[PDB]
Scaffold this active site. Structure first.
Site, PDB file in Angstrom:
ATOM      1  N   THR A 239       0.829  -1.207   0.000  1.00 28.35           N
ATOM      2  CA  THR A 239       0.000   0.000   0.000  1.00 28.35           C
ATOM      3  C   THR A 239       0.865   1.259   0.000  1.00 28.35           C
ATOM      4  OG1 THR A 239      -1.786  -1.151   1.166  1.00 28.35           O
ATOM      5  CG2 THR A 239      -1.842   1.259   1.201  1.00 28.35           C
ATOM      6  N   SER A 282      -6.351   1.414   0.412  1.00 25.95           N
ATOM      7  CA  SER A 282      -6.795   0.216   1.125  1.00 25.95           C
ATOM      8  C   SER A 282      -8.261   0.472   1.439  1.00 25.95           C
ATOM      9  CB  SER A 282      -6.005  -0.017   2.406  1.00 25.95           C
ATOM     10  OG  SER A 282      -6.394  -1.253   2.983  1.00 25.95           O
ATOM     11  N   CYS A 348      -5.232   1.998  11.648  1.00 28.34           N
ATOM     12  CA  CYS A 348      -3.854   1.664  11.306  1.00 28.34           C
ATOM     13  C   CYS A 348      -2.802   2.026  12.339  1.00 28.34           C
ATOM     14  CB  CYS A 348      -3.483   2.274   9.961  1.00 28.34           C
ATOM     15  SG  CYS A 348      -1.843   1.787   9.416  1.00 28.34           S
ATOM     16  N   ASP A 389      -7.837  -2.810  -5.374  1.00 28.85           N
ATOM     17  CA  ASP A 389      -7.453  -1.510  -4.844  1.00 28.85           C
ATOM     18  C   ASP A 389      -6.620  -0.702  -5.820  1.00 28.85           C
ATOM     19  OD1 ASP A 389      -8.713  -1.368  -2.253  1.00 28.85           O
ATOM     20  OD2 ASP A 389      -7.179  -2.734  -1.470  1.00 28.85           O
TER      21      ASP A 389
HETATM   22  C1  HEM Z   1      -0.115   4.604   3.649  1.00 29.42           C
HETATM   23  C2  HEM Z   1      -0.161   3.242   3.899  1.00 29.42           C
HETATM   24  C3  HEM Z   1      -1.121   2.640   4.684  1.00 29.42           C
HETATM   25  C4  HEM Z   1      -2.486   2.691   4.544  1.00 29.42           C
HETATM   26  C5  HEM Z   1      -3.373   3.578   3.636  1.00 29.42           C
HETATM   27  C6  HEM Z   1      -2.986   1.760   5.524  1.00 29.42           C
HETATM   28  C7  HEM Z   1      -4.333   1.535   5.703  1.00 29.42           C
HETATM   29  C8  HEM Z   1      -4.884   0.717   6.661  1.00 29.42           C
HETATM   30  C9  HEM Z   1      -6.338   0.612   6.886  1.00 29.42           C
HETATM   31  C10 HEM Z   1      -7.508   1.164   6.046  1.00 29.42           C
HETATM   32  C11 HEM Z   1      -6.409  -0.106   8.039  1.00 29.42           C
HETATM   33  C12 HEM Z   1      -7.520   0.053   9.001  1.00 29.42           C
HETATM   34  C13 HEM Z   1      -8.411  -1.128   9.173  1.00 29.42           C
HETATM   35  C14 HEM Z   1      -9.346  -0.945  10.342  1.00 29.42           C
HETATM   36  O1  HEM Z   1      -9.700   0.217  10.655  1.00 29.42           O
HETATM   37  O2  HEM Z   1      -9.722  -1.960  10.948  1.00 29.42           O
HETATM   38  C15 HEM Z   1      -5.073  -0.599   8.418  1.00 29.42           C
HETATM   39  C16 HEM Z   1      -4.787  -1.489   9.432  1.00 29.42           C
HETATM   40  C17 HEM Z   1      -3.507  -1.918   9.772  1.00 29.42           C
HETATM   41  N1  HEM Z   1      -2.363  -1.473   9.135  1.00 29.42           N
HETATM   42 FE1  HEM Z   1      -2.175  -0.180   7.687  1.00 29.42          FE
HETATM   43  N2  HEM Z   1      -1.977   1.155   6.264  1.00 29.42           N
HETATM   44  C18 HEM Z   1      -0.826   1.722   5.751  1.00 29.42           C
HETATM   45  C19 HEM Z   1       0.448   1.404   6.174  1.00 29.42           C
HETATM   46  C20 HEM Z   1       0.753   0.420   7.095  1.00 29.42           C
HETATM   47  C21 HEM Z   1       2.103   0.002   7.417  1.00 29.42           C
HETATM   48  C22 HEM Z   1       3.401   0.593   6.864  1.00 29.42           C
HETATM   49  C23 HEM Z   1       1.974  -1.014   8.285  1.00 29.42           C
HETATM   50  C24 HEM Z   1       2.992  -1.773   8.843  1.00 29.42           C
HETATM   51  C25 HEM Z   1       3.735  -1.417   9.960  1.00 29.42           C
HETATM   52  C26 HEM Z   1       0.543  -1.219   8.470  1.00 29.42           C
HETATM   53  C27 HEM Z   1      -0.008  -2.098   9.374  1.00 29.42           C
HETATM   54  C28 HEM Z   1      -1.344  -2.223   9.697  1.00 29.42           C
HETATM   55  C29 HEM Z   1      -1.834  -3.129  10.695  1.00 29.42           C
HETATM   56  C30 HEM Z   1      -0.942  -4.047  11.523  1.00 29.42           C
HETATM   57  C31 HEM Z   1      -3.183  -2.933  10.757  1.00 29.42           C
HETATM   58  C32 HEM Z   1      -4.154  -3.580  11.738  1.00 29.42           C
HETATM   59  C33 HEM Z   1      -4.356  -2.760  13.005  1.00 29.42           C
HETATM   60  C34 HEM Z   1      -5.392  -3.357  13.947  1.00 29.42           C
HETATM   61  O3  HEM Z   1      -6.240  -4.159  13.503  1.00 29.42           O
HETATM   62  O4  HEM Z   1      -5.368  -3.012  15.141  1.00 29.42           O
HETATM   63  N3  HEM Z   1      -0.198  -0.340   7.735  1.00 29.42           N
HETATM   64  N4  HEM Z   1      -4.129  -0.027   7.597  1.00 29.42           N
END
Ligand code: HEM
EC number: 1.7.1.14
Length: 399
Positions: A239, A282, A348, A389
């Protein structure tokens, strides 16, 4: 009921259906691949509701969970990490790794992030543009997020290039199910070895923190440290790559926005905020199962029925963001926040890290290459397939 996922109207645009549903039927049913029905929420207000309601569940094993593909159904059997957990287990596990992702930890990570970005731009400058355009994705967009996350986890510097290549294989469209799974176990195997090392001699990285604070004390198992580490690596890397490329393509599309950024790099944070709203890379992650009857608008979602909240649609909600389909980094922001990174407890974990990486990229890229331009006509940009996506596969550029 129309089948979901919907296909994007075009390369850079969201599905045409959302605008219509928002206007005429905000909460409606869609047909999934296996014939099952799920509710789709499209309004910002309802998406925020779905992301915070205590009556909704994130557990993937629950009958009713909206899996979007056959493969997604097979992935639901694996042992769950906090991403697939509900309270109180969710925060219990998420809190083990969240300290590295806090606003202050990320602020202290700025000098490093800047250094990484400078080095990759410098390499791309030495690489050259003499014999034709360079693919911004493989030379810059892909390495930036990968090296950083790999380094935060604890990977040695000389192993970054090989590991970055392997992770790219899992999410490559031109990759066989064979290649993708061999890449998965390769990475999984390497992380398990790294875990064995940090238990013996820990360091200043996420894996050593898990080993010292959770594994040794007997809070979690060795294989749990491996799964969490893997989750952090694969979760949003692809992403991030897409967001960087999408940012460059968007600036090529609006010369006026580009002119402003070049004139004032300090506008990068504003550019990044609008980019994450405009391009919701995403959009299929906010899925839930009703644990009990819940009313959303005029619908009533019955216990055990699935729900998919479109943050992409919410980000284009006319009711919240005025002129939602216009890309404007100078946009006047409402009190309600964009949902590019989610909302609620599952918002996130890397939101701040992601924004820091994007802000560093866009406040430096054009200072290094003021004449950087997409070498192919905009209408011919190789975006990801419409049924998935938003993203860009490759991006030929000259500078
Ligand atoms: C700009 C880039 C990114 C976008 C747009 C993005 C977007 C998202 C979205 C839409 C969700 C939210 C889902 C929810 O609300 O349940 C999410 C969850 C998550 N993202 Fe990202 N993300 C990004 C970058 C990252 C990166 C770099 C990591 C890695 C370290 C990451 C790790 C996670 C994890 C582990 C979750 C789950 C959190 C939870 O369920 O408590 N994301 N992300």
């Amino acid at each position: 009921a129309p089948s979901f996922p919907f296909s994007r109207a075009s390369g850079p645009e969201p599905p045409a259906e959302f605008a219509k549903l928002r206007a005429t039927n905000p909460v409606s049913q869609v047909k999934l691949f296996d014939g099952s029905l799920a509710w789709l929420v499209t309004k910002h207000k309802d998406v925020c509701f779905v992301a915070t309601s205590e009556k909704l569940s994130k557990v993937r094993t629950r009958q009713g969970f909206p899996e979007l593909s056959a493969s997604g159904k097979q992935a639901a059997k694996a042992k769950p990490t906090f991403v697939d957990m509900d309270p109180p287990e969710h925060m219990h596990q998420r809190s083990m790794v969240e300290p590295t992702f806090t606003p202050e930890a990320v602020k202290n990570l700025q000098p490093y992030i800047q250094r990484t970005v400078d080095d990759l731009l410098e390499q791309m400058k030495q690489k050259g543009c003499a014999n034709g355009p360079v693919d911004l994705v493989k030379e810059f967009a892909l390495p930036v997020p990968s090296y950083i996350i790999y380094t935060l986890l604890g990977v040695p510097f000389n192993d970054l290039e090989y590991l970055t290549q392997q992770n790219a294989i899992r999410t490559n469209g031109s990759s066989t199910a064979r290649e993708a799974s061999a890449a998965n176990q390769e990475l999984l195997d390497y992380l398990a070895i790294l875990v064995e090392q940090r238990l013996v001699e820990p360091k200043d990285d996420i894996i050593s923190k898990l080993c010292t604070e959770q594994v040794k004390p007997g809070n979690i198992d060795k294989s749990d440290a491996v799964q969490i580490a893997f989750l952090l690596l694969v979760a949003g890397n692809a992403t991030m790559v897409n967001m960087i490329a999408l940012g460059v393509a968007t600036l090529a599309q609006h010369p006026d926005q580009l002119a402003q950024l070049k004139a004032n790099p300090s506008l990068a944070p504003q550019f990044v905020e609008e980019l994450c709203r405009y391009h919701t890379a995403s959009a299929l992650a906010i899925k839930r199962t009703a644990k009990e009857d819940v009313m959303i608008g005029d619908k009533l979602v019955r216990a055990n029925e699935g729900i998919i909240a479109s943050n992409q649609s919410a980000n284009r909600d006319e009711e919240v963001f005025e002129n939602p389909d216009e890309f404007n980094m100078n946009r006047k922001w409402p009190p309600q926040d964009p949902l590019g990174f989610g909302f609620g407890d599952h918002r996130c974990i890397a939101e701040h890290l992601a924004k820091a990486e994007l802000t560093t990229v866009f406040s430096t890229l054009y200072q290094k290459f003021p004449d950087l331009k997409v070498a192919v006509p905009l209408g011919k940009i190789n975006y990801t397939p419409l049924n998935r996506d938003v993203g860009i596969v490759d991006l030929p550029v000259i500078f």
